[PDB]
Amino acid sequence: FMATKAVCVLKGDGPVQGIINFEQKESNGPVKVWGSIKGLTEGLHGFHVHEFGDNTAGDTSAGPHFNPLSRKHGGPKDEERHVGDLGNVTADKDGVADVSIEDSVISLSGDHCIIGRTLVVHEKADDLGKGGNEESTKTGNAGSRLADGVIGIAQ
Ligand SMILES: [Cl-]
Ligand SMILES: [Cu+2]
Ligand SMILES: [Zn+2]
């Protein structure tokens, strides 16, 4: 089987929630990521795929950012990045982040497959590895998880 579409329902302990859609018509092509997230503070919020689709214990059970190539944290456009580094979503004045992303590193098939893994929206902006500290090189200093969910097959 080869997934062409995926979906992730994001939920948390507070007001943050949303639906994220993934589309990839070609196995060797980019993934379109689109949807909306509500209940956010206005501004930038870190947006990452973590390694495991698990919250057995909590944040640790989702593991670090998905990182099959053993690289350091960066932005989605950087050559040096984790596969799960999708950068930041932007929330407007009403707390709605309209997500519109095209990425060529994540995939719905193969070694970079994100199906069965966890998508997370964070409290703070992702510094893209440019924060000048150790945490920047791992998480981008995006802080706590406001909402998460496991990425499932949709088509
Ligand atoms: Cl760029
Ligand atoms: Cu994260
Ligand atoms: Zn990362």
Author numbering: -1 to 153
Lines from the paper:
In this study, we determined the crystal structure of the double mutant (C57D/C146D) SOD1 that mimics the overoxidation of the disulfide-forming cysteine residues. Aspartic acid mimics cysteine-sulfinic acid in terms of the electrostatic charge and the atomic arrangement. The crystal structure of the C57D/C146D mutant SOD1 determined at 1.8 Å resolution showed the metal-bound SOD1 dimeric structure at the active site, which contained one dimer in the asymmetric unit. This result indicated that the metal-bound SOD1 was crystallized despite the small portion of the metal-bound form in the protein sample. The metal-containing state of the C57D/C146D mutant SOD1 adopted a similar overall structure to the wild-type SOD1, with an RMSD of 1.311 Å between the protomers (residues 2-153) of 152 Cα atoms. Notably, the loop was disordered (chain B) or significantly displaced from β8 containing mutated Asp146, resulting in the open conformation at loop IV (chain A). The open conformation of loop IV in the mutant SOD1 was distinct from the wild-type and the previous C57A/C146A mutant SOD1 structure. Charge repulsion between Asp57 and Asp146 appeared to induce conformational differences in loop IV in the overoxidation-mimicking mutant. The open conformation of loop IV in the C57D/C146D mutant protein indicates the increased monomeric and flexible nature of the cysteine-overoxidation-mimicking mutant SOD1, which is consistent with the MALS results. In the mutant structure, the arginine residue is disordered by lacking the interaction with disordered or displaced loop IV, as observed in the hCCS-complex structure. This increased conformational flexibility of Arg143 in the C57D/C146D mutant may account for the low catalytic activity of the metal-bound mutant SOD1.
Eukaryotic SOD1 is a 32-kDa homodimeric metalloenzyme containing Cu and Zn ions at the active site in the active state. The protomer of SOD1 forms an eight-stranded Greek-key β-barrel fold with four conserved cysteine residues and three long loops (loops IV, VI, and VII). The Cu and Zn ions are bound at the active site by loop IV, whose conformation is stabilized by the highly conserved intramolecular disulfide bond between Cys57 in loop IV and Cys146 in 8th β-strand (β8). Eukaryotic Cu, Zn-superoxide dismutase (SOD1) is primarily responsible for cytotoxic filament formation in amyotrophic lateral sclerosis (ALS) neurons.
